[PDB]
Assembly symmetry: C2
Homo-oligomer: 164 residues x 2
């Protein structure tokens, strides 16, 4: 039921629901080093998933969210996309933001389906659908949203409301 | 055996050798549209394979080679890497060159092993090893080189030599 600029797109996999537990996964950091979800043990996690964080013009609502989220107590914001570490290191949505890091799925495309954000049709096939998943320090889903429209601003407030 | 800064890296697949024919493959162009080897049937091709074309450091020698090869009669230069199309437009060796296009493997990781450039270990696992493959109008390999040292400049002269 997800669309791109109005045009329907098929997104595969099971999108995590509240109360569910997200399994450990391994991604790649800006320095090409492996970064596992459990590397942030006993910490709340915010999975900010984007088809691409290298769209050029940086956002604003996007950066605003990352800042406010990372400023919360004992929480880490993970911006996830299939962009390679080289490109993610330039992402302006989480630059001077301490508790905000970008991690790449380039050698773990299997994760896309595992998180229910696997775009399978259209020019964006092979990329992760826009989504926001909040996890507690035990990796339990406190909140999650698979944006119906890729080019649409996620319900950021709802994501923050649960973190506090 | 290929190495990176001395430390050897494992590269899977059968690297095309002179005397072999390369089969058609489909990659993704800068506009996210599919691009196939067959789209340039009856023309010579130069497959310029890079671990990444978004390293932040772009040598003028990289751009020079593309221009020289592309200026050759009935020749198309395909710069290939796992960088997403969004980043492949930030490459200094393709932008502005008529017969020099960049294409991404993000939707076709199987192509890595197919061309024997599949890096499997180290921090570059998941990327395509540095290589240059020159094909004739029949997709027969005229020259090919799997760069023994990723940080080494390919033998561009040898590649141009077979086309003129």
């Amino acid at each position: 039921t997800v669309t791109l600029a109005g045009n329907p797109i098929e997104v595969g996999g099971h999108f995590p629901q509240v109360g569910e537990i997200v399994e450990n996964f391994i991604l790649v950091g800006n320095d090409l080093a492996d970064v596992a979800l459990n590397d942030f043990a006993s910490k709340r996690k915010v999975l900010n998933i984007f088809p691409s964080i290298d769209t050029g013009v940086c956002a604003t609502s996007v950066r605003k969210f990352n800042q406010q989220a990372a400023k919360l107590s004992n929480t880490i914001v993970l911006c996830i996309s299939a962009d390679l570490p080289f490109a993610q290191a330039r992402f302006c949505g989480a630059e001077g933001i301490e508790n905000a890091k970008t991690v790449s799925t380039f050698r773990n495309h299997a994760l896309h389906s595992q998180l229910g954000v696997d775009i399978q049709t259209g020019p964006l096939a092979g990329l992760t659908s826009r989504a926001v998943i909040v996890l507690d320090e035990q990796n339990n889903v406190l909140h999650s949203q698979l944006v119906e429209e890729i080019k649409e601003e996620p319900n950021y407030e709802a994501a923050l409301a649960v973190l506090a």
